[PDB]
Amino acid sequence: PPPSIRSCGSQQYVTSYIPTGAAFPPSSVQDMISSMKSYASATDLVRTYSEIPSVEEALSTLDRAAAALNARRYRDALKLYLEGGYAMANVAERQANPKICNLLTSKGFETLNWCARLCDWIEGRIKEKHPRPGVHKVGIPVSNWDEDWVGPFMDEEEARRMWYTPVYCPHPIDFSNLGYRLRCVETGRRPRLMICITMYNEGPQQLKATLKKLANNLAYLKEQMPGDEKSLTGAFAGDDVWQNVLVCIVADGREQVHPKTLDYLEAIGLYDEDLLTINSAGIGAQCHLFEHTLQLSVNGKCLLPIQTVFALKENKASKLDSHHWYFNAFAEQIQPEYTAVMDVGTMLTKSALYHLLFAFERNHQIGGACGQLTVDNPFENLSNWVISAQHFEYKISNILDKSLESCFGFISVLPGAFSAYRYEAIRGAPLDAYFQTLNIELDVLGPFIGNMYLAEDRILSFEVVARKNCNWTMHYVKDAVARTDVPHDLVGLISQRKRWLNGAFFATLFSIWNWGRIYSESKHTFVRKMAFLVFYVYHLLYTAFGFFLPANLYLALFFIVFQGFQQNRLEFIDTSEYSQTVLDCAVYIYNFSYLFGLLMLIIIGLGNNPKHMKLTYYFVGAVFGLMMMLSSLVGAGIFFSTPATVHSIVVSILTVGVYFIASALHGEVHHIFMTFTHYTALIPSFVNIFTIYSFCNLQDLSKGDFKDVIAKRRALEELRREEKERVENRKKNFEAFRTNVLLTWAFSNLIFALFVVYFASSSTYMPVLYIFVASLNTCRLLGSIGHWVYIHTEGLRGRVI
Amino acid sequence: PPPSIRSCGSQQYVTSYIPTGAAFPPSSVQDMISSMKSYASATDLVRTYSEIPSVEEALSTLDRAAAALNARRYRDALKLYLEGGYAMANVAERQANPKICNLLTSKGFETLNWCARLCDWIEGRIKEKHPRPGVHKVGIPVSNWDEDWVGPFMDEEEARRMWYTPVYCPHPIDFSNLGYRLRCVETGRRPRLMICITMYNEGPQQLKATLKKLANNLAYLKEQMPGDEKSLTGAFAGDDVWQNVLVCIVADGREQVHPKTLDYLEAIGLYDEDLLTINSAGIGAQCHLFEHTLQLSVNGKCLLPIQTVFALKENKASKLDSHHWYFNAFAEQIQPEYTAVMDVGTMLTKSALYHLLFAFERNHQIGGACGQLTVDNPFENLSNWVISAQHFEYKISNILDKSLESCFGFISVLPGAFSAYRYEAIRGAPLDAYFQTLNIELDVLGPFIGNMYLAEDRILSFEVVARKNCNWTMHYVKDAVARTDVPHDLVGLISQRKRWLNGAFFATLFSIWNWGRIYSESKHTFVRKMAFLVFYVYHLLYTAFGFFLPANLYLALFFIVFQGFQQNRLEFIDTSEYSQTVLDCAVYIYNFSYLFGLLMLIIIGLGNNPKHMKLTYYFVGAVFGLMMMLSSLVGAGIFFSTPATVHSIVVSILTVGVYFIASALHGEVHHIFMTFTHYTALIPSFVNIFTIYSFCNLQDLSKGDFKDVIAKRRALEELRREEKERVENRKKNFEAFRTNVLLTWAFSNLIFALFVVYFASSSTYMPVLYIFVASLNTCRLLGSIGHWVYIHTEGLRGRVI
Ligand SMILES: C[C@@H]([C@H](N)C(=O)N[C@H](C(=O)O)[C@H]1O[C@@H](n2ccc(=O)[nH]c2=O)[C@H](O)[C@@H]1O)[C@H](O)c1ccc(O)cn1
Numbered sequence A, B: 001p002p003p004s005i006r007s008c009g010s011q012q013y014v015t016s017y018i019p020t021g022a023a024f025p026p027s028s029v030q031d032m033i034s035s036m037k038s039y040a041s042a043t044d045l046v047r048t049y050s051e052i053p054s055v056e057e058a059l060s061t062l063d064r065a066a067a068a069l070n071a072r073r074y075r076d077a078l079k080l081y082l083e084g085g086y087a088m089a090n091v092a093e094r095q096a097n098p099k100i101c102n103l104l105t106s107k108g109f110e111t112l113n114w115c116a117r118l119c120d121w122i123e124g125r126i127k128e129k130h131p132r133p134g135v136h137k138v139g140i141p142v143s144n145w146d147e148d149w150v151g152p153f154m155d156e157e158e159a160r161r162m163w164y165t166p167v168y169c170p171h172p173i174d175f176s177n178l179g180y181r182l183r184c185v186e187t188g189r190r191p192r193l194m195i196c197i198t199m200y201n202e203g204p205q206q207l208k209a210t211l212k213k214l215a216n217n218l219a220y221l222k223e224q225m226p227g228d229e230k231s232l233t234g235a236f237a238g239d240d241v242w243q244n245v246l247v248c249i250v251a252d253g254r255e256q257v258h259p260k261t262l263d264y265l266e267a268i269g270l271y272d273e274d275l276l277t278i279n280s281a282g283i284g285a286q287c288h289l290f291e292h293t294l295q296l297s298v299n300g301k302c303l304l305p306i307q308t309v310f311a312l313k314e315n316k317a318s319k320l321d322s323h324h325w326y327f328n329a330f331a332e333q334i335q336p337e338y339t340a341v342m343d344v345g346t347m348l349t350k351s352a353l354y355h356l357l358f359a360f361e362r363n364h365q366i367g368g369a370c371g372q373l374t375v376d377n378p379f380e381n382l383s384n385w386v387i388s389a390q391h392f393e394y395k396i397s398n399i400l401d402k403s404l405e406s407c408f409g410f411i412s413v414l415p416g417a418f419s420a421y422r423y424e425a426i427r428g429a430p431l432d433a434y435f436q437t438l439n440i441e442l443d444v445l446g447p448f449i450g451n452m453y454l455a456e457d458r459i460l461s462f463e464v465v466a467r468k469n470c471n472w473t474m475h476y477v478k479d480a481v482a483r484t485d486v487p488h489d490l491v492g493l494i495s496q497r498k499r500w501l502n503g504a505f506f507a508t509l510f511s512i513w514n515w516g517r518i519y520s521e522s523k524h525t526f527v528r529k530m531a532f533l534v535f536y537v538y539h540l541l542y543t544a545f546g547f548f549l550p551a552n553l554y555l556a557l558f559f560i561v562f563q564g565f566q567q568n569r570l571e572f573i574d575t576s577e578y579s580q581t582v583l584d585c586a587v588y589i590y591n592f593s594y595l596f597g598l599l600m601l602i603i604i605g606l607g608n609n610p611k612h613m614k615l616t617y618y619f620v621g622a623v624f625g626l627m628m629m630l631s632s633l634v635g636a637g638i639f640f641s642t643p644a645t646v647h648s649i650v651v652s653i654l655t656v657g658v659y660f661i662a663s664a665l666h667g668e669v670h671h672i673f674m675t676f677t678h679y680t681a682l683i684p685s686f687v688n689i690f691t692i693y694s695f696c697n698l699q700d701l702s703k704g705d706f707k708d709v710i711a712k713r714r715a716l717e718e719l720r721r722e723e724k725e726r727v728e729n730r731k732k733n734f735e736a737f738r739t740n741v742l743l744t745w746a747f748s749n750l751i752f753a754l755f756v757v758y759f760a761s762s763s764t765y766m767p768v769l770y771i772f773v774a775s776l777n778t779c780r781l782l783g784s785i786g787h788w789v790y791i792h793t794e795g796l797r798g799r800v801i
């Protein structure tokens, strides 16, 4: 028996008792339903309101249809798709904008055709697996077209029409199977060189500069003189090079892209928001790709056309995901010869591409190459110390380490900004191991492989060399100069260096672990294997020396300066005077300052992000810099006061002057003269702060009834709880690993320093350090000289062999 | 002109060009639409599928309607509500379960009535603000009813029917305005005592034990003898006490509640999932409240009925949110006299409620009270050291500190588990300052107030005492014993103590800062103000001594033991022998071990959660415990070897024997004898580990056209980005504050220790430490004696004054 519940939702508060008996008797609910007339008025109002559709409602219904389709529920998807298609078809007539009307009409027709196909599939007429809306790319005229633009030859269709398509491909390996195609393949062009420009949260100016530099490189390639020994021949000749080059600009997510970048892209005809909103309504695409042959004009000079494909990902992932999409999809479809990777803002010189291609074509044993990386405008604003220190570090690292490693044909790390490979040595296993993280969950891999995060360059570089049944070697080209932009503040440098150091350490450990694969699996010459063994020994010694660097720096500074002051070993002054208080005071002050600084640095680094601790980092860096400058002046005075000896001059040369000798040999000596002091002032800051912050923040990484409804809710809750538990366990394991590594490193350094400062004297310790440093620098100088000899001799001597 | 796009969605890949001209010509789209017959088949299939509705579809449509209503879009809400109501009305007949059929029919009728009311409101007939679906509570029979249960007197409606209602009230202050009512108010009962039992992720056994203990307390109150001086009279008499007590069980979220807890609650007739799923479909309620008068039977004894209200929150928030709901809504509606707060698992003795109520009624100057908190089964499993240490700490803290602070009528912290207030001294400003975090965003408050997180008890306790135009004092009742459950492992204790220590430190700073409000604003007696001034001086000295505790412990251990060994100051042995190597070796080993342990502890604490670092924490704790035990044995030997003096015996008494004297005075001496060694073995662990982990993890805390659509998307994106930036800035500020505090604390301790160990000797330092400790313990002993004298005298001497 129904109670008096006729007015229950209208009244503010109603209390009712609902008995569970033997269900409500029939013929009573009918009277209650039929006795209400307000329902008729409500239905009339709803029908009046629902007569006129809206664009937003149609788009929302299509989005819901896509969400239902992704959940493998097909009848609801069909109903929602039909509703959305009819709504869009009705709306299209009302709109006054011609472009909007045309897009709405086309989308409505496409949705209705997809509804028909899905209905046929449900009935069983069509037998397919995982049916999805058919691929349909739309070409529209570009809003801005430059009438005053002179080019080689442009078809009107190619010159005035920009093409768009949304891609749903979840695994990029299946891009070609799902039926997606690029304009280059359709037009019959077969590009031989591909360039990828990863982008994320960047201003328009950087992208404009990068595109201008690429256009200048293409122009330089076009004007190459024919009939010369040094001229490229074939697919990279003149007047037709631009048809063999494709530029893929991959963005990392619509949410984080700077709006002015989107405005600039729309200006050059590579992005349109209305088309993206309309044509991607029901697809639920993972990515949106626009295609054009863009034409750029700078000042009164018109550049060459660039065949550009702009791929914008809906969500946000890592740069490795952008490389995944680029390599797998575009390379496996186009099948090019070379493959260049660069970042946004990397401005190239006119001859960079020419030098890379010349090396690749002439040598032919090269599976990868990297150019020289420089700091833009180093001399300008010379008063800044961080910029000059970075310039010195880049120059010295390039010369010495890159030359030494390129002599043996194995470069430890390709920069990842302006590097190149050939798509024959990386097609198989090297790329599979490159994207191991993206294909396997971090739970299975473990903490060691997972913490090798942002170290992907070294993984690819090592996998190329040690490939089974192949002998691919890497190379370093000096003349391919690319200028980047560096942070102007200490905090920016500290933030930047963390990824570099984590990746370097763990990739170095991986390479040391797996170096045997070169001899066990690869197919190299015996001479190459012996050279690799020598380089392996040198690499082990260098890494071992670099692991104990803070302790060695502390010991050197302490012994030389402060125990020379305390125990009368400075030569330009005598400390046999003084009241025995200053002599101990110097050592005590040094020890207390060093220990307090290290404690503060480790607390800050393990504690918080280095953005709100700007003042404290600046203070610690200033203290260490003043200490290092004072120590350098004292050491210079000591060296010049000594009457000099053969051993002294030999050690001084092989320790310090190797930098100047190599720089003068390669002709880049003025930069060293300008920036030597600035780099010297930041050595302890570099070592201590960067290593501590790298180790401390190692954790950072990426129909049914009622019972069916209840079961679904319970299953969803259980799955969510299991997922949360798994994520928690993963984070626990990675935190444990990073803490163990940091404890081992710090305690090893402390124990070494204490044992050497208590049981050893300066006279019985300093010669060993001098010998070690001299040996390392002698090896590096020999490597640099060998690289210079090769680069200046092999060109002439290739005729002999 | 339309292209050949008839087959575009069906085909795998189609390329089309959509010209933007002057829109598609008319009379061409009509032919294309009318030339397709597959649309008719698709429409027929959709109509056939959509003829039969489903429960899940109706619930989903109602949920979408609620979401639209919360967005203030009313026409779409009306349409979706009508669709859902009609769907549920149609479905109700098909279902075979009588309860489901009745609930579906009632929900359909209620939804249709709400649709009519909303239509009238839209037309303008009804003038209201923020209209919502009318409040409608449903009473249903309980599934399990105990026929064999003897009680005082139960109405059949109250005994067999459980009531449910969903509440949407966003601000709990408006609970009574929106029209929600409780069964107690409807029935005319006016409870005088309310008990809140906060729950989150708990097993059934703890809740069962808590309910059994509460029933036993009610039974003890019922059997109170009449016509006695010590017997309560009035609303807490016999045979009718159960009608004046209400128990509110507040849960923290459906997602995290243990399923067995829900099963047990459904067993006792306090939860039903079907009713919750059906009746909360379209309301979008913030909380769901069930009401019952539960009857519990344990073994062959039948307990008393308990008037229970179970409030389950949809989402998850803090315990402060549960207190917000409880206090504001239920207290402001019922308006009780007293208000007791306890946690789940707090098992009470039979006389706890009687003692609390007796104190409140007889004294009448008390605005809050707290009972004694004990560890359940302390003697059992005595081999565990953590449990015994916690038992000793609880007993000593209770006796000394609670007695001393209760003598002055100001208890620093009420436990929050088994505490009580009176709803006259907290109604206004104290509760407003209690929930300041929940009403004001943490951005405005700042880092100091925000970091006072989980310190709410101290805030309420201080706000009660210093209330303007009132003189409320707090009290401590010794006989109200409540037994809790403590962690059995070191890691659990470390995890638990962080909240306590953070809250204690920052609330203590706040109280010290704002102590002047008692004299400036409150209205106390002059004697009370002088006593508060004395207590303020003592509080300042105690806090200052506690801030420098690690340094003092290190200095005491070092000086006494290790410099007695090195410099021949142990009395039971002479070290004038030995080869001068062991004498320095002892000090060097002690210093190195202490420093390495502290470094490891700070690295681990600031780095990772103390759940995967179990072994390292255990190792450090074991090292410190062995050190402390050795030091204690050496000190005992030194003390017993000395021929003793008046100064020596006085210092020894006032330093160590105060614990035993006070414990014997209060009769709880055997526990001290059993647990003294266990507490002594963990003092350095307590101090160092708990303080470091507390300071390191301080950061932890809680119609339209196309252009309108584009504007909406852009506005949503901009709002999301601004929200993300604000959250990032807030976290940055709080991290900076915690790091500054930790650096200040650690460096102050280190500098103090170094300066005192270099410029001071043991003979010129130890007497000062002895005097300080003796003074503090003398003050605490005097406080305990005064409290005992009061509690044993005032009862007899109240006749005089
Ligand atoms: C630092 C680097 C350059 N200034 C840079 O910042 N490169 C970024 C990077 O490498 O992270 C680019 O990576 C992409 N990116 C970034 C974040 C993200 O979440 N997703 C994403 O795709 C963006 O395009 C971003 O420009 C410089 O040239 C350099 C110097 C020496 C060297 O040995 C290597 N590199």
Ligand SMILES: C[C@@H]([C@H](N)C(=O)N[C@H](C(=O)O)[C@H]1O[C@@H](n2ccc(=O)[nH]c2=O)[C@H](O)[C@@H]1O)[C@H](O)c1ccc(O)cn1
Residues within 6 Å of the ligand: B197, B198, B199, B200, B252, B317, B318, B319, B322, B343, B344, B345, B346, B373, B415, B416, B417, B484, B485
């Ligand atoms: C530790 C305490 C008791 N063992 C306990 O654990 N209490 C919890 C707490 O206080 O946090 C309860 O708080 C609620 N809670 C918890 C988390 C959440 O996210 N939400 C939420 O509501 C839960 O009911 C939870 O049982 C013990 O009795 C005690 C001893 C001495 C003392 O001075 C104070 N207390």
